[PDB]
Write a protein that binds this ligand. Structure first.
Ligand SMILES: O=C(CN1CCCC1)Nc1ccc(F)cc1
Length: 211
């Protein structure tokens, strides 16, 4: 086992194949402990989950400081934090996976390259190298800074995202809201008038598939 695993891939290869809460250590530093939910089952596992929508109990209409730091219950609905995502994605080359499920239907998207810049970039999104079944709805968002109501699409749709003008992906939108562009949307799967029941965003090293 690795004493200070830096992500869910290093925590897994530590043998632990059960999805749930694990401690990772940013940059392998024992003073940078971070509790994460690891999805150890989806496409070989080793995923840090950083967003989960599943029941609408948690409020995602939250401010810049909340999106920077993270909020919610890692076992239920939560957002891991942009500062955490920046620090994780700085560690090496990460891939993004998005898992969606609505009324029994599933879809996914994988982006071979995924990074989140630091606060001086307003946590700029990089997403490249799409594959999947959900449809490439993050391409629209590539290179965009993060937006909250207090730093306007976030206000206008009551969510938070790497908004452009405004979105094809709104996974931090209003739960169960089927009004145009208000809900948990992935446009190229279910459009703008269908709020998705279940959504997870997760990351792991892009080289995991052959390590
Ligand atoms: O749990 C908190 C609240 N405070 C901050 C530190 C311990 C108590 N925030 C948070 C929640 C979920 C997550 F994924 C990331 C951050």
């Amino acid at each position: 086992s690795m004493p200070f695993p830096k992500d869910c891939s290093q925590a897994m290869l530590n043998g632990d194949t059960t999805s749930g809460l694990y401690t990772i250590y940013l940059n392998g530093d024992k003073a940078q402990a971070l509790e994460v939910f690891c999805d150890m089952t989806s496409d070989g596992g080793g995923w840090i989950v950083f967003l989960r929508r599943k029941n609408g109990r948690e409020n995602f209409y939250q401010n810049w400081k909340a999106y920077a730091a993270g909020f919610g219950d890692r076992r239920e609905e939560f957002w891991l934090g942009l500062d955490n995502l920046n620090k994780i994605t700085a560690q090496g080359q990460y891939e993004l996976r998005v898992d969606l499920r609505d009324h029994g239907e599933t879809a996914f998207a994988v982006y071979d390259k995924f990074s989140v810049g630091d606060a001086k970039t307003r946590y700029k999104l990089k997403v490249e190298g799409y594959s999947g079944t959900a449809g490439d709805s993050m391409a629209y968002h590539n290179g965009r800074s993060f937006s909250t109501f207090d730093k306007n699409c976030a206000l206008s749709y009551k969510g938070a995202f790497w908004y452009r003008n405004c979105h094809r992906v709104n996974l931090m939108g209003r739960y169960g809201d089927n009004n145009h562009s208000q809900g948990v949307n992935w446009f190229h799967w279910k459009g703008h008038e269908h709020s998705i029941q279940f959504a997870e965003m997760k990351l792991r090293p892009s080289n995991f598939r052959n390590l």
